[PDB]
């Protein structure tokens, strides 16, 4: 049983991602549910998910392609009892060498503002805000992808 | 006696940008002084200004690089008898110029919600935002330079 990494839009890769947002962004932090799932998310939407076993998935981020070779990463969450050793930043590392091979130059986050550094180190740097949106700081980050 | 355009950190020409920014953010629109002006407004800051006659500047830019070759043009603004008659579309189609010249690839501009359509006729797109800040609606916009 080794770790897996999964990019796809399969309806059980799908609904990986879906429980861990579910249970990270809608019932242990409050957002409303019609919020944190949106348009966006159709059968053709395609998540990157990390899993210790095949019944086990502990981390997640959402693919969203946007216009001139720009990846947005977003809807990134990982699994209460598994946060803080690394498995975000390994899934991260992952998508960015996927984006890559699919001819996208630069990868783009919305961050909360306590996360600045934690994408700084896995070089990132702000080009906006901080702002606000939905009530809370946000702030833009790019990075080049080499 | 032919219009004329300037891009410099002059005397004279901050001069003339200082007095237009001035008379529309702070005295007509009531934006605090030292919100309007801030800590990039040094000696060796650039300006765009569009001058009709030598003793009349009528709308300005200044000139805000930042890294990986894009260009943000901001505090952008013109004298009020003299607003919707294209001068300020003018003034901007030359800064895009200047900018190329220098190795520039992309135009940057973080406008009021209410200029949206503007920027798009000339070529601009969202690619962040709505949001907020110092009170009102503002979106980040960009271009690629040819």
Redesign the interface.
């Given at each position: 049983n080794a770790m897996k990494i999964i990019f796809s839009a399969s309806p059980a890769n799908r609904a990986a991602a879906y429980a861990l947002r579910q249970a990270v962004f809608v019932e242990e932090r409050g957002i409303s549910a019609d919020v944190e799932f949106d348009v966006k998310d159709t059968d053709q939407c395609e998540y990157a998910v990390l899993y210790l076993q095949p019944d086990l998935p502990i981390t997640t981020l959402r693919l969203e392609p946007?216009?001139?070779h720009v990846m947005r990463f977003g809807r990134v969450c990982t699994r209460k009892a598994y946060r803080g050793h690394g498995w975000g930043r390994q899934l991260l590392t992952a998508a960015e060498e996927w984006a890559t091979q699919r001819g996208f130059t630069h990868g783009e986050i919305?961050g909360e503002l306590t996360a600045q550094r934690f994408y700084e180190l896995c070089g990132y740097?702000v080009?906006?805000?901080p702002?606000?949106?939905d009530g809370a700081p946000?702030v833009?980050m790019?990075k080049?992808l080499l």
């Amino acid at each position: 049983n080794a770790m897996k990494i999964i990019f796809s839009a399969s309806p059980a890769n799908r609904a990986a991602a879906y429980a861990l947002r579910q249970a990270v962004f809608v019932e242990e932090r409050g957002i409303s549910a019609d919020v944190e799932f949106d348009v966006k998310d159709t059968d053709q939407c395609e998540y990157a998910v990390l899993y210790l076993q095949p019944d086990l998935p502990i981390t997640t981020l959402r693919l969203e392609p946007q216009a001139d070779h720009v990846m947005r990463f977003g809807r990134v969450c990982t699994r209460k009892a598994y946060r803080g050793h690394g498995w975000g930043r390994q899934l991260l590392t992952a998508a960015e060498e996927w984006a890559t091979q699919r001819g996208f130059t630069h990868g783009e986050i919305h961050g909360e503002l306590t996360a600045q550094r934690f994408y700084e180190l896995c070089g990132y740097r702000v080009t906006a805000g901080p702002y606000d949106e939905d009530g809370a700081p946000v702030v833009i980050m790019h990075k080049q992808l080499l």
